[PDB]
Amino acid sequence: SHMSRVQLALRVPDLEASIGFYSKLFGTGPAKVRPGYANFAIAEPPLKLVLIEGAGEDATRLDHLGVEVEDSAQVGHAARRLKESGLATVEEDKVWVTGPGGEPWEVYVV
Numbered sequence: 606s607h608m609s610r611v612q613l614a615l616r617v618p619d620l621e622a623s624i625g626f627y628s629k630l631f632g633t634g635p636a637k638v639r640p641g642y643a644n645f646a647i648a649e650p651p652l653k654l655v656l657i658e659g660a661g662e663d664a665t666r667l668d669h670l671g672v673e674v675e676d677s678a679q680v681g682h683a684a685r686r687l688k689e690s691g692l693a694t695v696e697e698d699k700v701w702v703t704g705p706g707g708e709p710w711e712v713y714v715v
């Protein structure tokens with residue numbers, strides 16, 4: 606199986622303006638739009654961009670990060686590898702790990 610892409614989830618103050626900006630930046634409209642969130646599936650560069658409405662803030666912040674893989678089998682291998690590395694993990698197919706500075710990561714399947 607074995608390929609993957611980065612999930613970049615941004616907490617944004619202005620969702621509507623952000624959708625417009627990122628459509629222009631990556632040259633494609635969003636794949637999915639709902640009240641309070643929108644996501645882009647970008648081929649080049651390979652990226653899953655998630656825009657999360659945060660009307661409470663006044664500046665774009667990092668919401669969370671992720672590795673998006675092809676199937677559940679890849680998640681398992683990732684989950685086991687992270688555990689062997691000595692990283693404290695929580696595994697459901699999903700696995701969550703948090704960096705030293707508090708940035709949340711998730712390895713999940715599309």
Ligand code: NA
Nearest residue numbers: 610611651652
């Ligand atoms: Na990527």
